[PDB]
Amino acid sequence: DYYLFLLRHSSLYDSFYYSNYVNAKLSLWNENGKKRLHKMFARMGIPLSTAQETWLYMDHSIKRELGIIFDKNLDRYGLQDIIRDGFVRTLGYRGSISASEFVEALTALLEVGNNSAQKLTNLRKRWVSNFWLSWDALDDRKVELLNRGIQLAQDLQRAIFNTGVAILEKKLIKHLRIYRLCVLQDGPDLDLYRNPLTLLRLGNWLIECCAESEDKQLLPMVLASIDENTDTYLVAGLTPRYPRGLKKPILNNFSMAFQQITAETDAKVRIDNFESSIIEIRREDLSPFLEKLTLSGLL
Amino acid sequence: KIYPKLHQMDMDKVSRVYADLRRESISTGSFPITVRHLESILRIAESFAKMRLSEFVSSYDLDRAIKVVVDSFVDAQKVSVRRQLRRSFAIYTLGH
Amino acid sequence: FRKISRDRGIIDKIISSMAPSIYGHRDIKTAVACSLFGGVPKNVNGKHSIRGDINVLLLGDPGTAKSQILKYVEKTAHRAVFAALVLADKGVCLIDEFDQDRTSIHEAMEQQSISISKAGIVTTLQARCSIIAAANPNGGRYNSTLPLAQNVSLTEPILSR
Amino acid sequence: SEIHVRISDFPTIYSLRELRESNLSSLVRVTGVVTRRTGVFPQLKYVKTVYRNYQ
Amino acid sequence: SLPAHLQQTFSPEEIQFIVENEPIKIFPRITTRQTRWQLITTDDKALNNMVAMRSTEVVLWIALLLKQQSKCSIVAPQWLTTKELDRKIQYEKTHPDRFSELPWNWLVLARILFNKAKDDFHDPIHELRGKIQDLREIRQIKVLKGLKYLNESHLQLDNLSLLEINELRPFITEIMDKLREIHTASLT
Amino acid sequence: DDDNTEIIKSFKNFILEFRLDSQFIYRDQLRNNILVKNYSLTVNMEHLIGYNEDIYKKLSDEPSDIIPLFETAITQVAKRISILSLPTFQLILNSNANQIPLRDLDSEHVSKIVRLSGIIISTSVLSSRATYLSIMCRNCRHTTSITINNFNVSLPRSCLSNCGPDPYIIIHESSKFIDQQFLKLQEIPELVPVGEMPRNLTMTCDRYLTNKVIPGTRVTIVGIYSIYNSGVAIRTPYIKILGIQSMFTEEEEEEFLQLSRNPKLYEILTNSIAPSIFGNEDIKKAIVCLLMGGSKKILPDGMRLRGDINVLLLAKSQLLKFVEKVSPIAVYTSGKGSSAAGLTASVQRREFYLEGGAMVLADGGVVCIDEFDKMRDEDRVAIHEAMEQQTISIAKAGITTVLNSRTSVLAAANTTILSRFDMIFIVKDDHNEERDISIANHVINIHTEISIEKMKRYITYCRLKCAPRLSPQAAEKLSSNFVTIRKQLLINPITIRQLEAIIRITESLAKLELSPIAQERHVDEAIRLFQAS
Ligand SMILES: Nc1ncnc2c1ncn2[C@@H]1O[C@H](COP(=O)(O)OP(=O)(O)NP(=O)(O)O)[C@@H](O)[C@H]1O
Ligand SMILES: [Mg+2]
Numbered sequence A: 001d002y003y004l005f006l007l008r009h010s011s012l013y014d015s016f017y018y019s020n021y022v023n024a025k026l027s028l029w030n031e032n033g034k035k036r037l038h039k040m041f042a043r044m045g046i047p048l049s050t051a052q053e054t055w056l057y058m059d060h061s062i063k064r065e066l067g068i069i070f071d072k073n074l075d076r077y078g079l080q081d082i083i084r085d086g087f088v089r090t091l092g093y094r095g096s097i098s099a100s101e102f103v104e105a106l107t108a109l110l111e112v113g114n115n116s117a118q119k120l121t122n123l124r125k126r127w128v129s130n131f132w133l134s135w136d137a138l139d140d141r142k143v144e145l146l147n148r149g150i151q152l153a154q155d156l157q158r159a160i161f162n163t164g165v166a167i168l169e170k171k172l173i174k175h176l177r178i179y180r181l182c183v184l185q186d187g188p189d190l191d192l193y194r195n196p197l198t199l200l201r202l203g204n205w206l207i208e209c210c211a212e213s214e215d216k217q218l219l220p221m222v223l224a225s226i227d228e229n230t231d232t233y234l235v236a237g238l239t240p241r242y243p244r245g246l247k248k249p250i251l252n253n254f255s256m257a258f259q260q261i262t263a264e265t266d267a268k269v270r271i272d273n274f275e276s277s278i279i280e281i282r283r284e285d286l287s288p289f290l291e292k293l294t295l296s297g298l299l
Numbered sequence B: 001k002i003y004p005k006l007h008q009m010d011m012d013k014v015s016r017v018y019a020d021l022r023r024e025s026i027s028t029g030s031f032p033i034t035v036r037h038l039e040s041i042l043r044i045a046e047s048f049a050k051m052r053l054s055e056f057v058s059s060y061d062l063d064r065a066i067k068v069v070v071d072s073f074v075d076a077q078k079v080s081v082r083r084q085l086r087r088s089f090a091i092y093t094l095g096h
Numbered sequence C: 001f002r003k004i005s006r007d008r009g010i011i012d013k014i015i016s017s018m019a020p021s022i023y024g025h026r027d028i029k030t031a032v033a034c035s036l037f038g039g040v041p042k043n044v045n046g047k048h049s050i051r052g053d054i055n056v057l058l059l060g061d062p063g064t065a066k067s068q069i070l071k072y073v074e075k076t077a078h079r080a081v082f083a084a085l086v087l088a089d090k091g092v093c094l095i096d097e098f099d100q101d102r103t104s105i106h107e108a109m110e111q112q113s114i115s116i117s118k119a120g121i122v123t124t125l126q127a128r129c130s131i132i133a134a135a136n137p138n139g140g141r142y143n144s145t146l147p148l149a150q151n152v153s154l155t156e157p158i159l160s161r
Numbered sequence D: 001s002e003i004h005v006r007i008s009d010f011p012t013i014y015s016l017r018e019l020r021e022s023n024l025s026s027l028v029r030v031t032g033v034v035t036r037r038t039g040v041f042p043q044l045k046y047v048k049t050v051y052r053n054y055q
Numbered sequence E: 001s002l003p004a005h006l007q008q009t010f011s012p013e014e015i016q017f018i019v020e021n022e023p024i025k026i027f028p029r030i031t032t033r034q035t036r037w038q039l040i041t042t043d044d045k046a047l048n049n050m051v052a053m054r055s056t057e058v059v060l061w062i063a064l065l066l067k068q069q070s071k072c073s074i075v076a077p078q079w080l081t082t083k084e085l086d087r088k089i090q091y092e093k094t095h096p097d098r099f100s101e102l103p104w105n106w107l108v109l110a111r112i113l114f115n116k117a118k119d120d121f122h123d124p125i126h127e128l129r130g131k132i133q134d135l136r137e138i139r140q141i142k143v144l145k146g147l148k149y150l151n152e153s154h155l156q157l158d159n160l161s162l163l164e165i166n167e168l169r170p171f172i173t174e175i176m177d178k179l180r181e182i183h184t185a186s187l188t
Numbered sequence F: 001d002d003d004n005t006e007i008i009k010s011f012k013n014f015i016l017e018f019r020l021d022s023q024f025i026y027r028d029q030l031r032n033n034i035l036v037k038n039y040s041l042t043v044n045m046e047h048l049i050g051y052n053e054d055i056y057k058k059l060s061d062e063p064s065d066i067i068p069l070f071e072t073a074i075t076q077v078a079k080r081i082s083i084l085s086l087p088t089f090q091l092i093l094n095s096n097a098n099q100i101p102l103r104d105l106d107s108e109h110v111s112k113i114v115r116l117s118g119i120i121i122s123t124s125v126l127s128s129r130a131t132y133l134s135i136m137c138r139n140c141r142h143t144t145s146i147t148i149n150n151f152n153v154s155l156p157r158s159c160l161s162n163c164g165p166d167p168y169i170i171i172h173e174s175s176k177f178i179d180q181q182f183l184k185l186q187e188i189p190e191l192v193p194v195g196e197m198p199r200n201l202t203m204t205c206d207r208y209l210t211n212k213v214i215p216g217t218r219v220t221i222v223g224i225y226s227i228y229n230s231g232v233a234i235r236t237p238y239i240k241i242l243g244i245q246s247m248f249t250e251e252e253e254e255e256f257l258q259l260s261r262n263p264k265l266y267e268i269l270t271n272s273i274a275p276s277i278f279g280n281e282d283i284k285k286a287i288v289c290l291l292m293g294g295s296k297k298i299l300p301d302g303m304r305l306r307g308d309i310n311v312l313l314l315a316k317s318q319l320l321k322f323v324e325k326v327s328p329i330a331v332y333t334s335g336k337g338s339s340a341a342g343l344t345a346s347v348q349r350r351e352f353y354l355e356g357g358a359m360v361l362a363d364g365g366v367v368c369i370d371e372f373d374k375m376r377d378e379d380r381v382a383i384h385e386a387m388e389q390q391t392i393s394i395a396k397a398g399i400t401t402v403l404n405s406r407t408s409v410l411a412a413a414n415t416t417i418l419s420r421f422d423m424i425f426i427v428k429d430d431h432n433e434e435r436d437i438s439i440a441n442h443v444i445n446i447h448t449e450i451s452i453e454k455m456k457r458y459i460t461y462c463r464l465k466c467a468p469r470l471s472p473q474a475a476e477k478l479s480s481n482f483v484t485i486r487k488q489l490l491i492n493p494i495t496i497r498q499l500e501a502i503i504r505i506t507e508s509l510a511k512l513e514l515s516p517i518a519q520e521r522h523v524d525e526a527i528r529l530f531q532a533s
């Protein structure tokens, strides 16, 4: 199994192109990165028009030779970490799936399955129905629902990538001394980041990019997104992490910091999520809260 | 590269000007102004925004588009109607 | 580009640069520039659509520079047709003089795409273009005492559209 | 399976007037307007089978 | 009062209910022999006197109720084996009009045991599922030949299963009734 | 030799064994098809790949050779599941492989399975191909037979039973044939590079795939891409198709019946017509009557009584478009017409021919004219026959024919031609600034009571269900009113051709209620609405 985004569905080319690790290793947000991918497939001996075919229909010979082709070629691109072992399951004649693909299907179903207090209640009630839309997909009798989950997973990753490139190309990351700050004031559709899990997927994209872009300055990061209906920013505090191939674990300290500023502050804020690293605050109060936060020694 | 858009503030004034032009056209017995002219005004304002690489239409764009379309509409009319139109429309063809 | 666009009066300078060899006639240059830049197309599947192209007609006294500015536009513009609307797709179409031709233009101004059938065959084509036309006003000279219809050989919806 | 070399900037030019029998089987460089074009068809490459495009 | 679809016939649910009252052979994994069951529509002694891994006979609905949990295992009927089904298919092919002598509940019981008791067979289940299909297809050919003898008087059938009869009931009886009406009208 | 038997054995075991959960889906489909005398099977590629990838590999490498083997395997299974004679069955395929744009097909794709899409632009008539065929040998008068199959043959020359160089002829009296059809596929309009006209392909289908599509429809196709004979060493490409993709209920009429018993239905329908237009009450009422119409009748002496309605309007541009949208069938035109046929019809030239305008083309429906004053000279005289007789008749240049013109006309303009219409009215205007501001705000919104479809379906239902008759009270009322107006005019014209128009309006008013009889209630509103003046 390969750390490639949904290999056995869509195509081999899309598997590399949307992989969260490959983007950090080859810088796919710009053309000098994309050309490296074209160059790789040309050297590997795979015709580029076949690499884009649906992986079920891709030719049998390439399918069986792929396991050796990677051993000869990933080293030249510094990309050897793609290779690993994992668990695969199959039932009758309906074809294989790995656990890594299964969990992406389930998370996608959680995210996208189908004055202020009432709207918040409606939203939080909608998110609970998706629990049962995911629960009913753990049954082999209901593979039909699992396929829908996979179709949603692909669109979610597409929309995430199309926001990440905008953040990096417009250089919206602000490099403060103690931590890195990023705030989304507008977007193609900013509603997708109103759910916590989607926001964390975007954060995990940016964290891989920041982890590989320079050897220096492993820093905490703060990410926020506005909502036009509440006029509140949804804020999340994220740790750094060490690369895949490299020894105690680090700890997320934003919890105590957000709690202390919340205990002190004039600001209109909410803390009720299980994960205390995520908070919410009104439009005008973001800047004084972040000012008091950076003035604090708790970061 | 450039794909401009309208700003929702001054559009109330545009609607009032449209209604005023229609009222004045009927009052002198002219052939009436129509929705086609209003659409053309908005489209020309977008073009004026595009000319300076502005993604926003602005009040002066609407003013220039209004002048162009109103003057073009006036030029099509008979002479007596033309004099009544320009005497009333002075606050659009020359002023704003 | 951004440097010159940040300067004041760039609109007027673009219009001034339009058709250098021809003296005067600033309004014609303004209209031609507006047609070459154009608007944005929009559509609402709830019952409506709006074109981005801008169409212009010029009534010319004999020898008042009309054919020269059409030649100028032909060299200036990226893609164009001079007189066939398939070749004008996403471009500018130029007409310098003027029943089936007018009928084709009637369909072309009503639609943005053309459809035709012949011997049971059926097919479609795209027009999607800005039309610049010029004409001679019903003989030797225009009459200002009369409305426009008296001076042209055109149906009323043409002057509307 | 096979690569084609394309030559560029050949240093002498003819119109369609100056061609004579001495030019036969020589390389030439020519300019003009394309008056008419056929559709694309496949053509048999060798005379098991292989094809190539033609126009 | 009664629903429209139950005026003249039994639904498949009722057919399953009817079949569930039959006896079946089981191996229990616990001993009950020295509370007591105290049933009122069956024998009570067998369940009160079970001994682990000693074969005994009980009604099918209780057998499936036990097999829902670890406490029981079901012995397959002897006709439900590859050798016997092979012989029945050969009988079906040999005699092109007679129906082979399968039990009256063969379809229902097969499609119950394959779902509730897939683990307790000796033969590989993916072969039994094929041979059951072969039998049903051949019998359907023989049925389609027989519907050309609907008449004013009567018909004889043999070894046709309960579910197979119930499938056809509203067609045979209706067409036969109308032929009777047409004939007797000419006598009167 | 043995490979032909192993491949057939493999596909035979595929059909007999593929379960997904508990149903043998291909055995069931093959049986259910035979019962309705459909001899074909629709296999899906993904199931074949799941069962055994090697079989799919063989099929993908050499489709022209392997498709016939799978077809005969289907026949061998079809006999076991239904016999204790059948033709050869047609195999049909479904696939989700990546579509190739039609413009990219080239020499790399010859004799490969290809999936593409486009628009059908033409369809041939059906033609006959042979499958089983019988042969007679001219010299010895021996006989034999051959079995054709339609994949990429000629009569043999190995004489039998010397017997000669080319002795074989066909016995058409003892041979079997199938249907074949040709089609043309054009590339999708939103794919074409700018400034170019679209490219197209030609293709073939047989048996159950014939007569399945019509011109102008968008379709998706699965088929073998190949070449045929028709420069040097050059051949034409085409495609062999293997698959294609492209009255009232009770609960509906219950709503229409609930509307029919509403005490204010007439007001509701009038309010629902061009609701943006202010005022003009009687105009809206007249359009309802024009849409509903009277009742057609036929007498024992063969005379025929008209059902249609005709209205003229002297703002007005909007109503004709609204009528075009609400009507079940509609045609829109300006007075000069779409061709030299004009409104009615004309003769054109080389041999002469005839073509009809937008009176013949709207036959059976409604037609609306946008400027009736711009009518041509021939149409001015020809519309008399088109409206009075509901026909157009021509005897010119050896042509001698009559054309049907059964339609209701709506017209507008800005004389004696007004006599042709049942009702005439003049449009009226009001100049409230709020109305224009509302329209402008809606225009900016797009730039930045009963609904139409329900009303159209209701109008259709009423036209199909009811055709009501005058009660005797209405007859006394109408005749008394008729003689009263003529007497009043005499002491100070009304004529039978207008009495017979008032009757049609009366019937159309009774039609909304679905009342089988018309009543004085309807007569009163009919004469009240007759004030055209
Ligand atoms: N600034 C100018 N103003 C007017 N005419 C000019 C100007 N410069 C050149 N001309 C000449 O005047 C004519 C310009 O008008 P133009 O329409 O091109 O001529 P034309 O085509 O012969 N008249 P017409 O046939 O009615 O279109 C040409 O003959 C030009 O050479
Ligand atoms: Mg000129």
Ligand SMILES: [Zn+2]
Residues within 6 Å of the ligand: F137, F139, F140, F141, F142, F159, F160, F161, F163
């Ligand atoms: Zn012979």
